[PDB]
Symmetry: D2
Subunit: 244 residues, 4 copies
């Protein structure tokens, strides 16, 4: 029988923030397609989602794969009406040691992928007169961090792109927003020491690291009818690490 739920596409859905976002959108009643870089990673997503989603392998650096994935979704599940662009790969270095590849790969994975995927889903959202594009940004697009000139430039570019797109698509009722996580507990933070997690949490007004679910909760809100008059904004979810 036919897939009748609205379709959400969450890139980088294997773990942490992306995993929580995908699961929450399933809970919210979407049919969720999540992506992983590998086929075995995709198969794990398929396992996790069961009969209310699918896992697909996608290297977001490649236009042909983006186009193939979205076409596959359209042909099998439905038009992508919620797009969550989620990527957290970093290639950090002070600028004097930041290579051409450190730069290009991060700009491609983060910002170019947002451009390509957003462009690819617009026709479906225009036809529906409904759409949500939700970009996962970062506190470091706002708060300066040495060694991450590449990642910061990408995330800031994503927020500016989102403003531009929000203006272009707003008459059609499609909203385009970013969520900027702060210090969220991930495999990366789990790998740090307790002392270093304390040094982080002391900087957060709420005195703790966040959880992937806090980011999922923000995305869930923005993807819902409770957020239909919010567009071109950055929703900061950082426990008061960065306020203004």
């Amino acid at each position: 029988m036919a897939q009748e739920r609205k379709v959400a596409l969450v890139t980088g859905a294997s773990r942490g923030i992306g995993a929580a976002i995908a699961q929450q959108l399933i809970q919210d009643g979407y049919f969720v397609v999540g992506t992983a870089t590998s086929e075995s990673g995709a198969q794990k997503l398929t396992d996790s989602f069961g009969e209310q989603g699918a896992g697909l392998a996608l290297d977001v650096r490649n236009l042909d794969e983006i186009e193939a994935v979205v076409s596959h979704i359209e042909q099998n599940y439905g038009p992508v009406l919620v797009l969550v662009n989620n990527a957290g790969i970093t290639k950090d270095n002070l600028l004097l040691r930041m290579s051409e590849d450190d730069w290009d790969d991060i700009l491609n994975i983060h910002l170019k992928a947002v451009y390509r995927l957003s462009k690819r889903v617009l026709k479906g959202m225009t036809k529906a007169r409904f759409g949500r594009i939700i970009n996962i940004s970062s506190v470091v697009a706002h708060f300066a961090n040495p060694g991450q000139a590449n990642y910061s430039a990408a995330k800031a570019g994503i927020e500016a792109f989102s403003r531009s797109l929000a203006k272009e698509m707003g008459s059609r009722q499609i909203t385009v927003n970013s969520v900027a996580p702060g210090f969220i507990a991930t495999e990366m933070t789990d790998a740090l020491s307790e002392d270093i997690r304390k040094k982080m949490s002391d900087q957060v007004a709420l005195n703790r690291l966040g959880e992937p679910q806090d980011i999922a909760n923000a995305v869930s809100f923005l993807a819902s009818d409770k957020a239909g008059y919010i567009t071109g904004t950055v929703l900061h979810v950082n426990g008061g690490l960065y306020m203004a």
Copy 2:
């Protein structure tokens, strides 16, 4: 139930906030400027709320209202500071009273009421202070220097207070409405409303419920890691 206090709950944004927080499961105390307005709120909320008269310009009234809530219903654990009164004028025409009354109603009230609810929230290790700001704290609108100053003041206040209270798991945030359909804007002409909605990316005025939805989100466990921020609800009128 936890108690929420929502000022200026008679109509528009305040009324929609109060009704939503009831639906969310809070016991809602709403305030109005007169005893008569307060009765209308009592009548609207029934067993899930109460109406009180309050002139938010008056400290003695603020302290009596909160004391009355503590004695009868319980500690105020969600505070929504909601004011929409304007006294617009170009600066050359803006009187001392136009300046003062807007700074008092909007920003001073936020200082006073926030201070008065700290003790209960501190003891609970739970709190939500949610301040209604405005898009005009960010985008300059000629004639509203008083209103814009007050609301920007509120946002900075909120940041300071979020840092002070965060270890107790009390969040302090602002919601900044854009052009929201009200009696005020219904009273305007068709051409005027058109010029407003043409500035909005979504090409429409918002509704009080859009603001209530944002406050409801922030007041819930779904926003427990969000503090010291401004949640812009303006349809892309202003993007930041």
Copy 3:
């Protein structure tokens, strides 16, 4: 003989930032009126400025004094065409210990004075089709600081007021801007320990406290013809303490 230079009014000109701003505007060719809270403080300013400025006693909390001072300047020296609103008094306390007076006095000294003085000088600047209103704000209008809810609210209100006023007066070519100092060396910072000044300077990208002259340099730029297309902005002078 008649006073022919354009007149600048710098409130709080006794020391530190205000003193440097007043001296620099004299260097720039203005006739500078500076204010102090006391008559003896005013007399020291008069001494400092010599025949190219004047010191006047002003408690910026009082409308009658504001009106008297500006009238005195108009009657003796000329129309106020550069207004620098400079105040650094604080009454810090966590909100639970912040009195009605802690709140009201800071909002009056900072924000109400900006409203009153700006309003009072507009007629002269309108007639000249030239004006500069330069408000000294603070990094804490942006970067959250516990214990300064009063001061932060005031300074943020000042920046929003400046935007409103800039829009109202822009057709007449009057610019309205704020300068937001960071950690600047003052009597207050001199009173701190060397260890505490180090802890401050480690937070500044430039690895040092600023000087009053750095703020004077910013005000000088904004008051000049080099800044005639800049209005409604905040010029941050903080060594990278706060960037965005």
Copy 4:
């Protein structure tokens, strides 16, 4: 004299910047897209400057140009990254090349040239990197998603780099022009220009010199405590 390198120095904002920095006392190397344009700059600058051909999309050219400057004139101690090329289109019509060419010309060039000048500035314990951004990195203009992304990218880049280089007394800042009169805007109609200047609080388009004045300020000792900021030069078109 200290050497300044100003890209895109042939006309408009770049030309005004280059001429101002000469007046300020810098030896200015200006770049143009062709050998012929480069000669015109040599001819304009005379003994106080030099013109070089540079395609800022090409890393080998960037490295050769800077090497040529180091060998002949001295270390680049002021770098002004100035690009104004647009390839506008609604996203639905924006090609891969429209996206890439604008990201490369604007943001990649800033990455490449900034990296290449660090060593000289580090040794000198003096530097100014001044990046020309745009009001559109802040205020969304439909059709300019590429340009807006690139310039916002530049601003965040600058913040990161300011933190890395600040201990060496190297400042990194952006200047964000609004609507500035150029050949581009001279080519537009009277009605179009009117609609632009009506959005500006000062009710006029700016001039290239207004931008040159801002860059000159930032490049001087008068701005030695300013780093990681955006200096908005837009006549109140956008206020923040």
